[PDB]
C-alpha cells in the first residue's frame, strides 16, 4: 500500500483536514524578502503601477515625484494606482450617510486622546529609523537621541511632556537652516601596543557632535530604512493620531472585521453569513467571494489618504486638521533607503567586494547579472546620488492598516451600481476581504462581482483574480479562518515555542501558563493541545532550571538537595515544581499563581521558609507572588 495523505480529504472536509498547516505565524529562516534587490524591486513595481500619472521634481528635496491620482482610467487588468478623488469622496460621503456622526465622534475622540497623550508613548512601537546615526534603533533610544539633539538645537518641546509640543518642535526642526546633533562613531585611536611601533589601533563607541544642512536633514526625516521598511521618529508622532482616528471609525463599522478575541472572529463570520442569508431574495442566490488583493500596499497612494483625513476631519478645528494632514503628507514625500548594496565577485581570483548603495552606478551595468541590470536600468530615473530612491506613490508597511481598512469598507458600502438586481456587502481586514452578493440568479451575482471589481479599481484597490474565487454562501475564508456551515478552523497557529521567558523560576511559570491560556482563548487552541503544551512547557522548565521531581532518579547540582527536600516534607504535593514538587496545573487553574494554588497544601515549615518576609534573594504580564524563587541574575 502506498500512503497518500491527500486521501484524508475523501473522508473529512478539507477545511478541518487543512487546519494548522503552518505551526507558526512569523517569517521562517528561509524568508527571502530582504535586501537591496527586493527594495529595488518594490520601487520599480510601485513606479510601474503609477507610470501613467503626472511626473515632476520636488521643490523641497529635489527628487522625482510621481502622481497616479486622478490619472487615466485603466484599460487592462494589471495593478493600477490611478485612484479617482471624486470616487473616493463619494464612497466616504456614503459611509458618513450610513453612520451619522461617526466621523465627527472619531475626530473628537482622537483629538482628545492626542491632547492627553505624552511624549513617552513613542516607545511602545518597534525598531525605528534614527537620523542621528542613520540606523535602525529601538524606539526608546531613537526618541532619546532625537530629544537630546533637539535640545542641542534649541527645540525644547519634550520638556513640557505633551506629545503635541514635541510634534510642533519636530515640525519646526524642518525649517532650521542647519541641524546640529550627536552621532555615534566607532572611533579608532591610539593605544600603547607591546609591539615596537607601540600602536594597537582599536575602536571605541565614541560620541561626537556633527552638523548637517536643511536639505540633508529633510531627506533624512522622510527616509524609511530597510529592516520591508521602517520609518523614523519624525513620523510616528503624527501616525499615532491618524491610526487612532481610523481605529475609532473602524470599531463602529459592522463590515470592518476587528474582533480580535479569537471567538469574536467566529461570531463575526457567523453573524455576517447569517445576516446575508436572511436578506437574500426569495428564490434568489447568495454567493460569497473569498478575495485577495494584488500589490495592496504598492497601489494605495498617500494623496488619497490625505484626502481621506481631510474628509473625515471636516467638522474639526483647523489645528487638528493640520495635525492630521501631516502623516500622509510626509508619506507622499518619502525616500526609500536601498540597503547594504550588491556583492560583486571574481571567481578566477577568488575575490569579493560589496558595492554600496551610493556607488551602485559607479560600475558599468554589464558587470551586474541580467535581473539586477534591468532593475538598475529602471531605477536610474528615481535614484538619488546618496544611496536612496524616490518613492512618492504607494505605501511600504502596515503604517496605515486602519485607514486602508476604512477605505476598503467604504468600497464595500456602495452595495450596488446602477440600481441593478444585486446587493453586495462583505468584510474587510486590511488587504483581506470577503464579498457577499445577493441576486436572483448566479449570472447577476457575477455581474455584481464584476461591478465591485471595477469600483475597487476606481479607488486604487486591486483584487487578485489569480487568488480570488467564489461559491454559494455558507463556505468561505477570511483572515486565515475557514468557515463552513458553521464550523470554523484556522490555517495557521503560533504554537508555543520551546524555552522560558527568562526572568526567574517564579515569573517563568506564570508567563508560560499565561501564554498557554491566551493561546487557547484567542487562537482557538483545543483542550488536548493545551494540556500537551502544558506538558511540554513543564518538561522544558524542569530541564532549564534543573528542578526535576524529588521522587525521580536524576543527578545534578540542585537535585541532590531537592531529593532531601522531598524526603523531609510530608505534604509533598504543595511543593513548587521549581523545588522538585509535582505539577498540578491544568486547564481550569491556568490563571492562578502556583504559590497561591499550593498554599493550602504547603507544609507550614516549607511555607515559612519559602515565603520568608526578608529572604536574601528577592531584595525589594504575569501574576507574581514574592518568594525565594523570584531572584535576580547579574
Amino acid at each position: 500500500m502506498n500512503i497518500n495523505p491527500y486521501f484524508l480529504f475523501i473522508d473529512v472536509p478539507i477545511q478541518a483536514a487543512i487546519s494548522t498547516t503552518f505551526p507558526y505565524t512569523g517569517v521562517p529562516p528561509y524568508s527571502h524578502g530582504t535586501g537591496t534587490g527586493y527594495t529595488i524591486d518594490t520601487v520599480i513595481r510601485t513606479h510601474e503601477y503609477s507610470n501613467k500619472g503626472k511626473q515632476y521634481i520636488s521643490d523641497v528635496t529635489g527628487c522625482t515625484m510621481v502622481d497616479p491620482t486622478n490619472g487615466p482610467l485603466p484599460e487592462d487588468n494589471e495593478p493600477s494606482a490611478y485612484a479617482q478623488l471624486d470616487c473616493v469622496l463619494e464612497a466616504l460621503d456614503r459611509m458618513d450617510e450610513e453612520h451619522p456622526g461617526l466621523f465627527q465622534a472619531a475626530s473628537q475622540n482622537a483629538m482628545e486622546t492626542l491632547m492627553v497623550t505624552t511624549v513617552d508613548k513613542l516607545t511602545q512601537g518597534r525598531q525605528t529609523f534614527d537620523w542621528t546615526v542613520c540606523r535602525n534603533q529601538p524606539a526608546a533610544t531613537a526618541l532619546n537621541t532625537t530629544i537630546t539633539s533637539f535640545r542641542l538645537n534649541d527645540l525644547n518641546g519634550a520638556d513640557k511632556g505633551g506629545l503635541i509640543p514635541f510634534c510642533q518642535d519636530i515640525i519646526d526642526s524642518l525649517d532650521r537652516p542647519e541641524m546640529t546633533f550627536f552621532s555615534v562613531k566607532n572611533i579608532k585611536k591610539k593605544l600603547p601596543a607591546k609591539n615596537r611601533k607601540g600602536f594597537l589601533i582599536k575602536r571605541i563607541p565614541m560620541k561626537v557632535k556633527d552638523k548637517i544642512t536643511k536639505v540633508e536633514y529633510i531627506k533624512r526625516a522622510l527616509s524609511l530604512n530597510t529592516m520591508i521598511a521602517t520609518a523614523g521618529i519624525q513620523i510616528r508622532g503624527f501616525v499615532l493620531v491618524v491610526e487612532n482616528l481610523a481605529k475609532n471609525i473602524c470599531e463602529n463599522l459592522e463590515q470592518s472585521g476587528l474582533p480580535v478575541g479569537g471567538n469574536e472572529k467566529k461570531a463575526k463570520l457567523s453573524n455576517a453569513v447569517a445576516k446575508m442569508l436572511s436578506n437574500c431574495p426569495p428564490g434568489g442566490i447568495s454567493m460569497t467571494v473569498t478575495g485577495d488583493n494584488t500589490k495592496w500596499n504598492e497601489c494605495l497612494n498617500p494623496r488619497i489618504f490625505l484626502a481621506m483625513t481631510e474628509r473625515i476631519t471636516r467638522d474639526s478645528p483647523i489645528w487638528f486638521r493640520d495635525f492630521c494632514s501631516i502623516a500622509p503628507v510626509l508619506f507622499s514625500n518619502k525616500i526609500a533607503r536601498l540597503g547594504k548594496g550588491f556583492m560583486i565577485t571574481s571567481k578566477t581570483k577568488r575575490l569579493k567586494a560589496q558595492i554600496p548603495c551610493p556607488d551602485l552606478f559607479s560600475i558599468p551595468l554589464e558587470r551586474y547579472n541580467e535581473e539586477t541590470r534591468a532593475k538598475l536600468k529602471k531605477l536610474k530615473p528615481f535614484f538619488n546620488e546618496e544611496g536612496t530612491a524616490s518613492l512618492s506613490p504607494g505605501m511600504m508597511m502596515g503604517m496605515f492598516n486602519m485607514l486602508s481598512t476604512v477605505l476598503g469598507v467604504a468600497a464595500l458600502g456602495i452595495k450596488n451600481i446602477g440600481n441593478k438586481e444585486y446587493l453586495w456587502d462583505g468584510l474587510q481586514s486590511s488587504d483581506d476581504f470577503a464579498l457577499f452578493v445577493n441576486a436572483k440568479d448566479e449570472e447577476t451575482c457575477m455581474e455584481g462581482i464584476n461591478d465591485f471589481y471595477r469600483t475597487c479599481k476606481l479607488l486604487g484597490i486591486n483584487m487578485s483574480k489569480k487568488k480570488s474565487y467564489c461559491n454559494e454562501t455558507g463556505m468561505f475564508e477570511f483572515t486565515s479562518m475557514f468557515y463552513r456551515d458553521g464550523f470554523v478552523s484556522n490555517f495557521a497557529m503560533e504554537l508555543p515555542s520551546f524555552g522560558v521567558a527568562g526572568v526567574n523560576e517564579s515569573a517563568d511559570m506564570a508567563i508560560g501558563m499565561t501564554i498557554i491560556k491566551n493561546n487557547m482563548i484567542n487562537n482557538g487552541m483545543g483542550p488536548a493541545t493545551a494540556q500537551t503544551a502544558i506538558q511540554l512547557f513543564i518538561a522544558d522548565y524542569r530541564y532549564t532550571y534543573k528542578c526535576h521531581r524529588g521522587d525521580s532518579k536524576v543527578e545534578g547540582k540542585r537535585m541532590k538537595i531537592i531529593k532531601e527536600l522531598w524526603e523531609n516534607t510530608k505534604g509533598r504535593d504543595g511543593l513548587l515544581v521549581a523545588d522538585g514538587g509535582p505539577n498540578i496545573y491544568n486547564l481550569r487553574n491556568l490563571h492562578i499563581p502556583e504559590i497561591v494554588l499550593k498554599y493550602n497544601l504547603m507544609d507550614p515549615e516549607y511555607k515559612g521558609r519559602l515565603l520568608h518576609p526578608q529572604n536574601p534573594f528577592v531584595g525589594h504580564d504575569y501574576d507574581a507572588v514574592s518568594g525565594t524563587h523570584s531572584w535576580r541574575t547579574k
Partner: protein
C-alpha cells in the same frame, strides 16, 4: 478614592463619566483624578439644567426645559443632535462639541471648573473657542465668570457653588487635595512642511488650500457610476463556472522521465538511519560519554581505519571526509573532556572552510573590470522519486521504540479537561511508537546540541554526537548513536551566517540500490552488524552541509509538529462532533453503539483505494507534519500557501456549491512555479494528482 466618588456622586453620573472615559479609551482605571473632574463637570451641568424650565412661547417656569444637555451621552448621537439644532436654528455649528445648548438664546454654551481663579480659565477658553460659545465658569473658591446676563440666575448658581464645598472640604479632610484634584491646543505649520503639503496634493490642484476647499464644498454624488460607464470593458474579472473537467493535474513536468530524480537533501537520514543501541539505566549522560560508550560497544566499527568507498559525490574529496571522520572518532574516544578536534589545520581544508573568497576594498573592486555580480542559482527541475513514497510508508509505521516521555499535569475535574485528557491519551497510544516520533526527537536533540555548542567556545571544529534516548514496551532504556558531526566555528557571529556541519551517519542501506537518491552523499563501508543472527552491512553516509543559528532554533522548535498534529486531530474530531451533539472521540477511535469505528482512506494498492483505522490516519498526519517541517523551504511554503485555493475549490465542487473562478491558469501557474527540486513538493503534487483523479471518479457517482 473610588469609594469617595461612589459616595459623593450618584451612580448614574459615575457610570456616564466612565462611558465618557471609555470613549477616550487609554486606561479608565489608572487615572481617577480625571474621573473626578468629569463627574464634577456632569454634576455642574445637571445642576444647571435640571430645574431651569421653559414653556411654549416665553414662560420660564408644561415640560419643555430651556437647556439641552449634550454631555454624558455617546458622541455619535451628541454630534447629530448638535447638527440638528444648528440646522433648525440656523446658527453656526461649533467645530467643538458643546456641553449644553440654551434654548431662549438658541445658542451652544460651554462650562468649566477652575481651581485657581475665574476669568482666567474663561479667557483661556475664549482663546480656544472664540465667538462661537457662551462661557460660564464656576470656581472651587467662590467665583464666577459669564459672557451674558440672561443666563442661569443666582438661585441656580447657589446649588452649583455649594456642591463644590463638600468635595473641597472632604478632599482636604482626607488628605487627597495636595496629591490629586488638579486639572485648547495651538499647532502651527512652518514653511517647509507647508511646501511639502502644497506639493503633495492630487492632480488638478495647485496648493493644499485648493484641495481643502474642494473636498469640503463639492458634492461627489454620481462619480462612481459616471466613471464606471467610462472605463474600458476590458477591465473585468472574466468569471467562469468551475467544473471537474477544468481541474487539470498540477506540475505535469514531474512525469517527464528525461528529468533527474529529486535527490535526498534532508539534514539527517530519516528512514535509512541506523542507531547503535547501548542499553542503560536511564541516567542522563553527557553526549561525549554516551558516544564513547556506544562506540566501545561496537569496537569493530570504531576501529575500522581503512576506507572502502562505495559512492562519491561529484565535488567531494573522499580522503578529506574519511580523515574528518577518523578525527571525530578519535576525539570522541579519547580520555579528555573536550570535543574539539585535534587536527584543526587539516579540518580547516577538509570542511572546505579555507576555500572562502577574500574581501577587498570597494575601490579596487570598482576599478577591477573582471569583478561581476554572480548569477542566481536557478533550482533544477526534477521528476517524481520513489524514495519519497518509501519514506512516507516507512515513517508512518509502528516500531518497538518510543522517544516521548512527557511530564504529568493536574487532575481533571472539568468536563473539558476530561475530553482533552482522553483525546491526549488516544493520541499518545497511537503516536508513541511511530517511527516519525523517534526521527523528530533525533532531529530536535541534534539541533539543540548544535546550538548549545555554538557559544563563545573559541575552539572551532568541535565534534557533536547524533544521539537519542529511547524506551521500548518492556520499559528498557537505550542510548542510540546515529553518527557524528563536525561543527565548524564562524568568527563572524551574526545569527544569520553559515557554519559548516559535516555529518557522518550510520546506515544499513546500500546506496547502490538507489543511485538517484544519493548524489550529495559520499558513502563508505565500515563493517557489518548482527542484530538477530543476520548480517547487515553498515555504511557511513558523509555529507558537508551548512546551517546558521536561526535554522538551529527552527530545528529545535520542530518538536511543535506534535502539537500541530494533535491540533489537526482535534479539528477533525470537533468537525465530526459539530454534526452530532456530543463528543466523538470514543466514536472516532473505539466506536459506540450508535456508530462503528471510523475508517479513513489511507492509500492505494494496485490502483485500488485502501482503508485503515483512525490511528493509521493519525500516524500519517504526524509524519506529514514532520516531513513538512524537515523539508520546509521557500518552495514548500509557497506550495502549501497556494494549493489551499485549489483544495478549497475542490471542496466547493464536492459540496455542489457552484464555484466560479476568475483566473484558473494564473492560480495553476502560481502553484506550479514552486515545484522545482523540493522532494516533498513534488511528491505532494503527485499525491494531489492521484487524489484529484479519485475525486473526479467519485464525482460521477
Amino acid at each position: 478614592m473610588d469609594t469617595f466618588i461612589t459616595r459623593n456622586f450618584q451612580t448614574t453620573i459615575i457610570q456616564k463619566a466612565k462611558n465618557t472615559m471609555a470613549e477616550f479609551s487609554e486606561d479608565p482605571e489608572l487615572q481617577p483624578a480625571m474621573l473626578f473632574n468629569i463627574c464634577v463637570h456632569l454634576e455642574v451641568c445637571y445642576v444647571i439644567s435640571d430645574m431651569n424650565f421653559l414653556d411654549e412661547e416665553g414662560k420660564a417656569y408644561n415640560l419643555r426645559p430651556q437647556y439641552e444637555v449634550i454631555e454624558g451621552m455617546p458622541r455619535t448621537i451628541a454630534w447629530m443632535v448638535q447638527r440638528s439644532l444648528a440646522q433648525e436654528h440656523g446658527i453656526e455649528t461649533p467645530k467643538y462639541l458643546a456641553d449644553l445648548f440654551d434654548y431662549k438664546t438658541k445658542r451652544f454654551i460651554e462650562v468649566g471648573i477652575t481651581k485657581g481663579l475665574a476669568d482666567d480659565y474663561f479667557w483661556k477658553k475664549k482663546e480656544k473657542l472664540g465667538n462661537s460659545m457662551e462661557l460660564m465658569i464656576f470656581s472651587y473658591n467662590q467665583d464666577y465668570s459669564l459672557s451674558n446676563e440672561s443666563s442661569l440666575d443666582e438661585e441656580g448658581k447657589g446649588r452649583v457653588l455649594s456642591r463644590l464645598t463638600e468635595l473641597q472640604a472632604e478632599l482636604s479632610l482626607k488628605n487627597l487635595w495636595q496629591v490629586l484634584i488638579g486639572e485648547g491646543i495651538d499647532f502651527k505649520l512652518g514653511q517647509t512642511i507647508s511646501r511639502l503639503r502644497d506639493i503633495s496634493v492630487p492632480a488638478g490642484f495647485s496648493n493644499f488650500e485648493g484641495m481643502r476647499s474642494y473636498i469640503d464644498n463639492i458634492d461627489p454624488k454620481g462619480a462612481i457610476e459616471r466613471n464606471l460607464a467610462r472605463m474600458s470593458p476590458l477591465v473585468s474579472v472574466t468569471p467562469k463556472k468551475l467544473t471537474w473537467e477544468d481541474l487539470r493535474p498540477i506540475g505535469p513536468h514531474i512525469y517527464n522521465h528525461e528529468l533527474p530524480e529529486v535527490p535526498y537533501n534532508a539534514f539527517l537520514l530519516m528512514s535509512d538511519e541506523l542507531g547503535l543501541a547501548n542499553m542503560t539505566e536511564g541516567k542522563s549522560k553527557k553526549p561525549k560519554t554516551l558516544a564513547k560508550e556506544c562506540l566501545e560497544k561496537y569496537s569493530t566499527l570504531r576501529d575500522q581505519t581503512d576506507p572502502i568507498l562505495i559512492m562519491k559525490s561529484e565535488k567531494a574529496n573522499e580522503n578529506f571526509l574519511w580523515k574528518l571522520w577518523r578525527d571525530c572518532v578519535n576525539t570522541i574516544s579519547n580520555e579528555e573532556m573536550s570535543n574539539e578536534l585535534q587536527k584543526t589545520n587539516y579540518a580547516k581544508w577538509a570542511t572546505g572552510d579555507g576555500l572562502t573568497y577574500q574581501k577587498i576594498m570597494k575601490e579596487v573592486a570598482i576599478d577591477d573590470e573582471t569583478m561581476c555580480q554572480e548569477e542566481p542559482k536557478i533550482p533544477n527541475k526534477c521528476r517524481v522519486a520513489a524514495w519519497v513514497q518509501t519514506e512516507m510508508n516507512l515513517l508512518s509505521t509502528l516500531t518497538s521504540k518510543r522517544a516521548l516521555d512527557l511530564p504529568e499535569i493536574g487532575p481533571d475535574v472539568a468536563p473539558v479537561e476530561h475530553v482533552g485528557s482522553e483525546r491526549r491519551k488516544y493520541f499518545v497510544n497511537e503516536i508513541n511508537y511511530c517511527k516519525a516520533s523517534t526521527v523528530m526527537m533525533k532531529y530536535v536533540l541534534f539541533h539543540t546540541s548544535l546550538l548549545n555548542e555554538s557559544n563563545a567556545s573559541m575552539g572551532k571544529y568541535k565534534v557533536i554526537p547524533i544521539t537519542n534516548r529511547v524506551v521500548n514496551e518492556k520499559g528498557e532504556s537505550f542510548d542510540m548513536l546515529y553518527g557524528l558531526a563536525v561543527k565548524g566555528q564562524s568568527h563572524l557571529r551574526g545569527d544569520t551566517d553559515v557554519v559548516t556541519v559535516v555529518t557522518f551517519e550510520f546506515s544499513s542501506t546500500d546506496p547502490r540500490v538507489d543511485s538517484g537518491k544519493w548524489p550529495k552523499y559520499t558513502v563508505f563501508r565500515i563493517g557489518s552488524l548482527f542484530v538477530s543472527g543476520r548480517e547487515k552491512s553498515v555504511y557511513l553516509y558523509c555529507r558537508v552541509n551548512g546551517t546558521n543559528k536561526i535554522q538551529m532554533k527552527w530545528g529545535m522548535e520542530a518538536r511543535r509538529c506534535l502539537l500541530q498534529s494533535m491540533q489537526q486531530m482535534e479539528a477533525i474530531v470537533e468537525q465530526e462532533s459539530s454534526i452530532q451533539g456530543y463528543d466523538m472521540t470514543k466514536a472516532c477511535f473505539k466506536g459506540d453503539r450508535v456508530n462503528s469505528p471510523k475508517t479513513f482512506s489511507i492509500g492505494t494498492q494496485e490502483g485500488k483505494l485502501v482503508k485503515g483505522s483512525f490511528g493509521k490516519a493519525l500516524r500519517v498526519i504526524f509524519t506529514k507534519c514532520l516531513m513538512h517541517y524537515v523539508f520546509g523551504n521557500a518552495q514548500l511554503e509557497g506550495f502549501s500557501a497556494e494549493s489551499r485555493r485549489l483544495l478549497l475549490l475542490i471542496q466547493a465542487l464536492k459540496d455542489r456549491k457552484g464555484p466560479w473562478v476568475f483566473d484558473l491558469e494564473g492560480m495553476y501557474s502560481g502553484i506550479e512555479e514552486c515545484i522545482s527540486n523540493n522532494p516533498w513538493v513534488i511528491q505532494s503534487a503527485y499525491w494531489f494528482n492521484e487524489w484529484l483523479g479519485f475525486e473526479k471518479e467519485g464525482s460521477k457517482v
